[PDB]
Amino acid sequence: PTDDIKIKEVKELLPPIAHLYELPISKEASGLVHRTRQEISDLVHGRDKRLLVIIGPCSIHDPKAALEYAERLLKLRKQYENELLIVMRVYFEKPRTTVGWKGLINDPHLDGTFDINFGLRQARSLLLSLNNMGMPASTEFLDMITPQYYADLISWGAIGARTTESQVHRELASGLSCPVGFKNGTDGNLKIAIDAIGAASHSHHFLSVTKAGHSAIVHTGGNPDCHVILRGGKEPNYDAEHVSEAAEQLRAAGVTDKLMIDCSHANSRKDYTRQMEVAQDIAAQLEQDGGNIMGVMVESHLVEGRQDKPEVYGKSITDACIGWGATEELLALLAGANKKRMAR
Amino acid sequence: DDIKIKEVKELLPPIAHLYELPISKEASGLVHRTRQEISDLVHGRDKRLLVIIGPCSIHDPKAALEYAERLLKLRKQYENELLIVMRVYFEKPRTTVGWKGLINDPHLDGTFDINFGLRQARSLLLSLNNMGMPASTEFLDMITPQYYADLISWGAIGARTTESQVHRELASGLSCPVGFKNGTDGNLKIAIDAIGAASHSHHFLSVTKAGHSAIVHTGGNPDCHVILRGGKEPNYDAEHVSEAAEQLRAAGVTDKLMIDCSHANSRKDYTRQMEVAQDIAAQLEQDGGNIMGVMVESHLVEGRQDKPEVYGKSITDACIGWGATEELLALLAGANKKRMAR
Amino acid sequence: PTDDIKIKEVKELLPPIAHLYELPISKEASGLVHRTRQEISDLVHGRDKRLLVIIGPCSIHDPKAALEYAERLLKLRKQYENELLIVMRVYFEKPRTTVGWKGLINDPHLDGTFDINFGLRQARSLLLSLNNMGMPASTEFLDMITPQYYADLISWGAIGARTTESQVHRELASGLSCPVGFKNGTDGNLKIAIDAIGAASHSHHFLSVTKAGHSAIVHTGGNPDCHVILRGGKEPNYDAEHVSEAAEQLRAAGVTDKLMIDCSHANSRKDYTRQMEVAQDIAAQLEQDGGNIMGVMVESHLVEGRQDKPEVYGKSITDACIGWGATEELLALLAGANKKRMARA
Amino acid sequence: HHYPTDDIKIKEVKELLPPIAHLYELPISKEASGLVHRTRQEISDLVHGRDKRLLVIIGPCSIHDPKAALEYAERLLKLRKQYENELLIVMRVYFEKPRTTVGWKGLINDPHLDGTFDINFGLRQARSLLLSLNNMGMPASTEFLDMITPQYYADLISWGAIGARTTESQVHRELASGLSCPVGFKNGTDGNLKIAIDAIGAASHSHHFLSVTKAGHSAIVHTGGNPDCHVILRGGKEPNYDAEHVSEAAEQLRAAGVTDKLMIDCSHANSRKDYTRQMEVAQDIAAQLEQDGGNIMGVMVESHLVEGRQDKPEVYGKSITDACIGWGATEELLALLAGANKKRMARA
Numbered sequence A: 001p002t003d004d005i006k007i008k009e010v011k012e013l014l015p016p017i018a019h020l021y022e023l024p025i026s027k028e029a030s031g032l033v034h035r036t037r038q039e040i041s042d043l044v045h046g047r048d049k050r051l052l053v054i055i056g057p058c059s060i061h062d063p064k065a066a067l068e069y070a071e072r073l074l075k076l077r078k079q080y081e082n083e084l085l086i087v088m089r090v091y092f093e094k095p096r097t098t099v100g101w102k103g104l105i106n107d108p109h110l111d112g113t114f115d116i117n118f119g120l121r122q123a124r125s126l127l128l129s130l131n132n133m134g135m136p137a138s139t140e141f142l143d144m145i146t147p148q149y150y151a152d153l154i155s156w157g158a159i160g161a162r163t164t165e166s167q168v169h170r171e172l173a174s175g176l177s178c179p180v181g182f183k184n185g186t187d188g189n190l191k192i193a194i195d196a197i198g199a200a201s202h203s204h205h206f207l208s209v210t211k212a213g214h215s216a217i218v219h220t221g222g223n224p225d226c227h228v229i230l231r232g233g234k235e236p237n238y239d240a241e242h243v244s245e246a247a248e249q250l251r252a253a254g255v256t257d258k259l260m261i262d263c264s265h266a267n268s269r270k271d272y273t274r275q276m277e278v279a280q281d282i283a284a285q286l287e288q289d290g291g292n293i294m295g296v297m298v299e300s301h302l303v304e305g306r307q308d309k310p311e312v313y314g315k316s317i318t319d320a321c322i323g324w325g326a327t328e329e330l331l332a333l334l335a336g337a338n339k340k341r342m343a344r
Numbered sequence B: 001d002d003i004k005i006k007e008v009k010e011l012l013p014p015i016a017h018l019y020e021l022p023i024s025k026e027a028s029g030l031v032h033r034t035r036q037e038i039s040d041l042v043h044g045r046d047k048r049l050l051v052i053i054g055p056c057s058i059h060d061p062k063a064a065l066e067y068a069e070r071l072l073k074l075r076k077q078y079e080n081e082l083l084i085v086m087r088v089y090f091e092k093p094r095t096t097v098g099w100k101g102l103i104n105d106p107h108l109d110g111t112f113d114i115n116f117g118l119r120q121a122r123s124l125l126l127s128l129n130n131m132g133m134p135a136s137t138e139f140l141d142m143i144t145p146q147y148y149a150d151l152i153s154w155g156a157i158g159a160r161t162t163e164s165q166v167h168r169e170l171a172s173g174l175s176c177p178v179g180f181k182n183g184t185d186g187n188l189k190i191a192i193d194a195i196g197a198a199s200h201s202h203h204f205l206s207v208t209k210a211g212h213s214a215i216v217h218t219g220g221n222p223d224c225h226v227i228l229r230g231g232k233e234p235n236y237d238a239e240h241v242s243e244a245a246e247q248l249r250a251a252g253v254t255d256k257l258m259i260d261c262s263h264a265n266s267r268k269d270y271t272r273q274m275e276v277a278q279d280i281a282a283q284l285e286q287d288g289g290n291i292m293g294v295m296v297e298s299h300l301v302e303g304r305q306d307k308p309e310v311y312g313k314s315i316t317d318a319c320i321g322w323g324a325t326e327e328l329l330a331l332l333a334g335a336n337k338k339r340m341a342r
Numbered sequence C: 001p002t003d004d005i006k007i008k009e010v011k012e013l014l015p016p017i018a019h020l021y022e023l024p025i026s027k028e029a030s031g032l033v034h035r036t037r038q039e040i041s042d043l044v045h046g047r048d049k050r051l052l053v054i055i056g057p058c059s060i061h062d063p064k065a066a067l068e069y070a071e072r073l074l075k076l077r078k079q080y081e082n083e084l085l086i087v088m089r090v091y092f093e094k095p096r097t098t099v100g101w102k103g104l105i106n107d108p109h110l111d112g113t114f115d116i117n118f119g120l121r122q123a124r125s126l127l128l129s130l131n132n133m134g135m136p137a138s139t140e141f142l143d144m145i146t147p148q149y150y151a152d153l154i155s156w157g158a159i160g161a162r163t164t165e166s167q168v169h170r171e172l173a174s175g176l177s178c179p180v181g182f183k184n185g186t187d188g189n190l191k192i193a194i195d196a197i198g199a200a201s202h203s204h205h206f207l208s209v210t211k212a213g214h215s216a217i218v219h220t221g222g223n224p225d226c227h228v229i230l231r232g233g234k235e236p237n238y239d240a241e242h243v244s245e246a247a248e249q250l251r252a253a254g255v256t257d258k259l260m261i262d263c264s265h266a267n268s269r270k271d272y273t274r275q276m277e278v279a280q281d282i283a284a285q286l287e288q289d290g291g292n293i294m295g296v297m298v299e300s301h302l303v304e305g306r307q308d309k310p311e312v313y314g315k316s317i318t319d320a321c322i323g324w325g326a327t328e329e330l331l332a333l334l335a336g337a338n339k340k341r342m343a344r345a
Numbered sequence D: 001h002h003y004p005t006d007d008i009k010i011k012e013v014k015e016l017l018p019p020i021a022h023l024y025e026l027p028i029s030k031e032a033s034g035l036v037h038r039t040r041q042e043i044s045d046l047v048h049g050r051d052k053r054l055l056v057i058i059g060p061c062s063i064h065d066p067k068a069a070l071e072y073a074e075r076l077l078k079l080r081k082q083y084e085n086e087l088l089i090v091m092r093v094y095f096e097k098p099r100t101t102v103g104w105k106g107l108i109n110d111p112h113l114d115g116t117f118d119i120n121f122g123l124r125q126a127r128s129l130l131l132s133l134n135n136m137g138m139p140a141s142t143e144f145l146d147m148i149t150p151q152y153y154a155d156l157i158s159w160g161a162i163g164a165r166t167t168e169s170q171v172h173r174e175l176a177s178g179l180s181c182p183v184g185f186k187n188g189t190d191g192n193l194k195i196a197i198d199a200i201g202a203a204s205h206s207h208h209f210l211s212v213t214k215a216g217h218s219a220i221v222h223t224g225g226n227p228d229c230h231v232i233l234r235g236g237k238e239p240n241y242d243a244e245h246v247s248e249a250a251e252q253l254r255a256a257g258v259t260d261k262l263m264i265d266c267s268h269a270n271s272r273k274d275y276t277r278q279m280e281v282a283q284d285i286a287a288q289l290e291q292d293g294g295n296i297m298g299v300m301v302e303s304h305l306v307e308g309r310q311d312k313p314e315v316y317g318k319s320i321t322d323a324c325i326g327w328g329a330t331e332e333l334l335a336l337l338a339g340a341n342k343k344r345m346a347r348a
């Protein structure tokens, strides 16, 4: 015996078309996705000076809270639309080296069953509702298969720090319909993210699944709307001198020198109250010059901090988020600052 | 939807390949026991040295089979000291443009003919196992393994994907032992982490033998280990080995590890592989109980070329030639004969 | 060029699992399907002397109407449950040589568009509701692929006169979880139906599709609960003499000699009123002896007759049916007659 | 949903390689494509009366041994070339006789003739044989029994049959509507011709039927319709090959506004299931061609290397299904038909 020795089971997976038939994209959702992708493209290439704000929970573990959060964020989206382009974080799984909760797609029931068919349906339904209420959505694509279930509803995608250097993730990015952000590496390596944009911009052949759930060869056209995200290393890398050094390197590689700064993760050193400090520093850069900044990322929820079990409503069970109060503060700060950049 | 997709193309499922090239009794037996033998090495139940040795990449099956036929003689000759398993990597991952590997580009001309490539890959691997040479490879994605993992005795996850969750989940379901390299700037924690993760059950999305998407529930891979392949500085010496083994034991994982003689440890100079090997040989005489394997980039002919003009010469990373391989292998054999006595 | 020369398009087909996931079979529907299949088997093999009545529209073109019909039929199902085993006709298409409306699965919108995905979803939705309210369902399986979408909701199946002689339909029958009736051929050939019962009782290997929509080899175990249906020919064949001759031939092939009589189609000469005459003759055979009769088939709707376009609620757009009044009478007539046959045990 | 209702009477569902796996190993060649393409057009011409050659669908009742088949084709090929101005000879390459009785289920189903079922091997063997035949210059004809097997080798078929037992089946008519080759519908097993006339009707229109893609996934196939369909007279209770039956069939066909050019099966019910009588039928057809017989566009003959039949595949090139005429009788029968038709063609 040499085949599937360490496989316990192979289970039935509904193909993407099953979900697309139940939850077809609406006219409005298409329009919103389409133009949000264009609008972000314009930010990536320096054609517009608004600040892309990718903001929301670290992960989504409860769609009801996600929709209530979206309702609130939507008012600030409209209010700040001339200064900020606000797009909600709708991430289904925090990649984790240890055991623990495996994300909404994997474990929608939050009990260690794996009900991926239900997860993908829930994921798509939440995304469709969000787009339907005027809130565009962003997410991190972890594998090569899940995107076929809801990428059509995504206006901006991330490739995480742990996969920016992975070739098949760069290939995936090269065929994604949405702009894509590549994070610097977990120890602060920027070059891998710069290379990724290089790779992602060219055509690739990668193996994936058709909408019908059958393996196929996908020939991509390249993604011209990729960029770097500074999310910290051994040290934080959000300040002006890091930004400026990043911008030089980007120009040096012939790619866009407009980048995004993540206020969270290793830039806050995992202390959610520091996100505001980073946003303050970014505010200060925009007021002085900050021409290379095109966006920021913030981990924000209804209620602040985090919990191991999903006991409190609207409170993260992955990374600790700022609460809604602080969120209003932060967005007002960034709006006020960028208005003054856009006048200059 | 699919705005940046040029084309979606027909892909034969693994069963089409498995139907034309079914694994043989002899190939199954060889894979089965080479896996056991390597498992014994990983867990410190046998003190032979695993040697993953062969071309950086396979671009010409004829040369590969030739190389194997010479490598087989040495495998048999050193069977008490070394467990020799040929490197049969089909692609070297590259940030920039260039040849994309045998699976992607079997014709070496920039056409993609993945169906032909997967067939060639499986046929080469089956022939190699049939003649008595087991095979090792790097699994880059979650689909290609279904086409030939049954013919593979040891697997690598590359430096670039050791931190990737889905690659760890893949390793958790791989029938073969798996080596995780430290990161391209020398980070070892990510490989230790990767071993921990890979030893547990996971649910990942992939494709059945029949080419249909499915949820695969894995049992966990107990036969994982790390590979020291250098970082900003090389990490092959006795001090690095010792500090690595302390870290591995601290994490509750096997402290038996493999050392790559090429790539960052040689400073990307193929000549230096022998210096690393010498250093490893010297550790084996003094103590070196934490070393279970070495990795060597080797071919019929030394160095490298941009186009496949010269027979048996790598077109990816530069390799030592057949000579320097007879030397490196003797050198490792001699040194480990001593280990296994004392 | 040699491939797909005369093919206009190949279109996306959701696999059975997609429908099974949205409309899983309920506990109650399962129990009812299970039990009804058993109860029918007992009739096929002469363990119970109730009369199976397959009754309802010639074809379903309107689920609302079908449900309302079921609600009324249900009361009579219960009322006569000791004499009659009443199962509703839920046929989606009447196969036709000519052009016209192609059934609910093919043309659920009744406008000449094709929307088979919607059709299959509607068909299963209706079948699940019917079973849930207590009404078991029967249908004609026309191809090898549609049964995966809803066979689990079907308590009795028919293979039509046009396909009884088809080997692939016999093979299909040999793997269907429900009893199956085979009709004599459109000119009155009975041998093909007897042959079909023989064939369907054995194991076969045919090619079909898994629940997941992938082609596969199905090894079937054989269907022991098949029987013939007398549906007329060049002449009608519902009378005692035809029944008696049909039973002789059945015993002679070593298959069950309990058969079903279709009161409609070529036994009524397509003139729906005459169904009552056939039932009357069936009642009269039951009173005398009628040991070989285990079921009847009747084409019945809320409103009698037929129409070309679906303008009048609850009226067939395929073969003309008797309306509700006559349905009550036909059922009372059959119940009364069969009560007397069961008493003579 | 605790009570069981699903796959109660299924023993097993097994793996089936999709058409593309066979098409990859055995792609159609330029020569085979050319031959299929033109043989179909040539047959279309006969169906629509633009050419007065006679289509001759001739060969074993069923193929149980590809080596014998190839040897048979080599022999038939010399007569195909020799009579090419009078006859259009196409080989019968039928894999499986439909049977009510248990017994051998054909080469696709049971390629090892031992009651195993190795349909993957069977389909590979069927395709290989059909490709070998087209590559040597012998076009091939077959009967399509199910909706799935055609995807494996219809690209190598120049003419298709719908059998007597399925001519009335709606799905088979829909299948015919999307088949790339001309198609003949047989009359029913008791002699009903109207079903075959209806079938031509139906097959000529567009349909939607459910089948499998080349990749093995179920799909909806929207067909264009098949304009190259015709009827086959194969007898009933009584034989139906003579001039009066022919003439009565032609009036019915015209009356239905379909082609009044038909094919006559010399075997099966027209021969009373007696292989020797095939020559009788051909003799009668020859007599019709000399008189007038304008409505006849083809004939069907069950022919093999060796005459008769056997239950076990003991003797080489001898049928295990319906009894066939041997090779001697075949040369006779074809010379007979050639000579007769040469005279018809000269009168116009």
Ligand SMILES: N[C@@H](Cc1c[nH]c2ccccc12)C(=O)O
Pocket: A144, A147, A148, A151, A152, A175, A176, A177, A178, A208, A209, A210, A211, A218, B001, B002, B003, B004, B005, B008
């Ligand atoms: N559907 C994705 C691209 C993509 C990812 N994986 C695929 C597999 C097949 C086809 C397309 C894809 C998009 O439009 O962004």
Ligand SMILES: N[C@@H](Cc1c[nH]c2ccccc12)C(=O)O
Pocket: A002, A003, A004, A005, A007, A010, B142, B143, B145, B146, B149, B150, B170, B173, B174, B175, B176, B206, B207, B208, B209, B216
């Ligand atoms: N077949 C692989 C395990 C595996 C990798 N990818 C898969 C996808 C599906 C099923 C199994 C797998 C092995 O034996 O090592």
Ligand SMILES: N[C@@H](Cc1c[nH]c2ccccc12)C(=O)O
Pocket: C144, C147, C148, C151, C152, C175, C176, C177, C178, C208, C209, C210, C211, C218, D005, D006, D007, D008, D009, D010, D013
């Ligand atoms: N599901 C059907 C049997 C069946 C029909 N077609 C199939 C194809 C595959 C497997 C089973 C089937 C039943 O239970 O009656």
Ligand SMILES: N[C@@H](Cc1c[nH]c2ccccc12)C(=O)O
Pocket: C002, C003, C004, C005, C007, C010, D147, D150, D151, D154, D155, D178, D179, D180, D181, D211, D212, D213, D214, D221
């Ligand atoms: N391929 C067949 C037609 C056909 C049969 N079944 C199909 C399913 C899908 C597409 C085409 C088909 C031909 O060319 O004659």
Ligand SMILES: [Mn+2]
Pocket: A058, A059, A094, A265, A299, A318, A319
């Ligand atoms: Mn986070």
Ligand SMILES: [Mn+2]
Pocket: B056, B057, B092, B263, B297, B316, B317
């Ligand atoms: Mn290398």
Ligand SMILES: [Mn+2]
Pocket: C058, C059, C094, C264, C265, C299, C318, C319
């Ligand atoms: Mn009817």
Ligand SMILES: [Mn+2]
Pocket: D061, D062, D097, D302, D321, D322
């Ligand atoms: Mn025959």
